[PDB]
Structure formats: C-alpha cells, structure tokens
C-alpha cells in the first residue's frame, strides 16, 4: 500500500504534517540546537500522528 | 484503537494529512466554489490517504 | 475580492467555518470512513455556509 504510493503522496501522508507543525514551533522558539530540537520534536509528538 | 484516541490524535490520524494538502491546493487555485472544490478534493484523493 | 486576499483570510472566508463544524462532528461521531464522512458533511451543509 504505502510503498506503492508516489513520493509526494507517501511523504504527505507519513511525515509532512508533523514536520510542518515542528517547523512552526522551531521558527517561533529558535532554540540553540535546531536540528536536535526538530528530531526531539518528532519523537515527542509522533504518537499524535501514528499509533506506533 | 482509533475510536478511543483523544480528539487531536484522532483527527491527526484520519483527516489532517489530506486536509493540509487540500487546503494548500484550494489556496493556490482559488476556484469559484471552494467548499465544493475541497470536498471533491477529499473524495478524489482519499485512496492515497487511507 | 476573494482572489486577492492573503491565504489565511481567503481560507477563513471560504472553508474554515464549515470545516470547524465538520471536524467537531467528525470528532464526536468517529464514523468508519472519516474522510468520506467529512466530504459528505461539506456537501450536505454547504448551502448554509455559502
């Protein structure tokens, strides 16, 4: 199913929503270690967007 | 189980991803009948998101 | 006119009000096919939001 999707649809369904949410938070907070911050953001919020 | 999730997680895992794309397309194209357009977008792209 | 509005105003003045209600109903009812339900909700209620 997922593996058959075109790139755009695959990404839009799996990571684009949590990423946009994370980028918005990053842009507002501007923390010292932005790449680390974004990785942590993804892990801290992944449960919202998928059921593990 | 989806049925017992909190509201935000429930919506995030069902309609948010296709809605984000639909709203982006709507904003770009600005068609004459936006509500109709958006509902059509959902139905036309549903197979890619469920 | 609508076509010249910035993105947020354009969406706020076209689909946000009916979406807010549709998402609320979706969250409460948690139907089996949420994307279909949401699109149907838009088409069924659009007369009251146009």
């Amino acid at each position: 199913d997922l593996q058959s999707l075109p790139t755009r649809a695959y990404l839009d369904q799996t990571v684009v929503p949590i990423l946009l949410q994370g980028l918005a938070v990053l842009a507002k907070e501007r923390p010292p270690n932005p790449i680390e911050f974004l990785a942590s953001y993804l892990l801290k919020n992944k449960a919202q967007f998928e059921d593990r | 189980d989806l049925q017992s999730l909190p509201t935000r997680a429930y919506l995030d895992q069902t309609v948010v991803p296709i809605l984000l794309q639909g709203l982006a397309v709507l904003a770009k194209e600005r068609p004459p009948n936006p509500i109709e357009f958006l509902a059509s977008y959902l139905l036309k792209n549903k197979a890619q998101f469920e | 006119d609508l076509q010249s509005l910035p993105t947020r105003a354009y969406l706020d003045q076209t689909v946000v009000p009916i979406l807010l209600q549709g998402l609320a109903v979706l969250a409460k009812e948690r139907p089996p096919n949420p994307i279909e339900f949401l699109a149907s909700y838009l088409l069924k209620n659009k007369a009251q939001f146009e």
Partner: peptide, 21 residues
C-alpha cells in the same frame, strides 16, 4: 510548501479550539 505552513496553522487552531469547545 509555504501555504502548507498556513494550512498547518489553520488546522492546528481549529483542533486546539475543539480542545475547549
């Protein structure tokens, strides 16, 4: 995408607003 950031904003508002009903 950029209006995706604004569609992002919008959906998030909505949901958070439903958090309080």
């Amino acid at each position: 995408l950029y209006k995706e950031q604004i569609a992002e904003d919008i959906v998030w508002d909505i949901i958070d607003e439903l958090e309080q009903i």
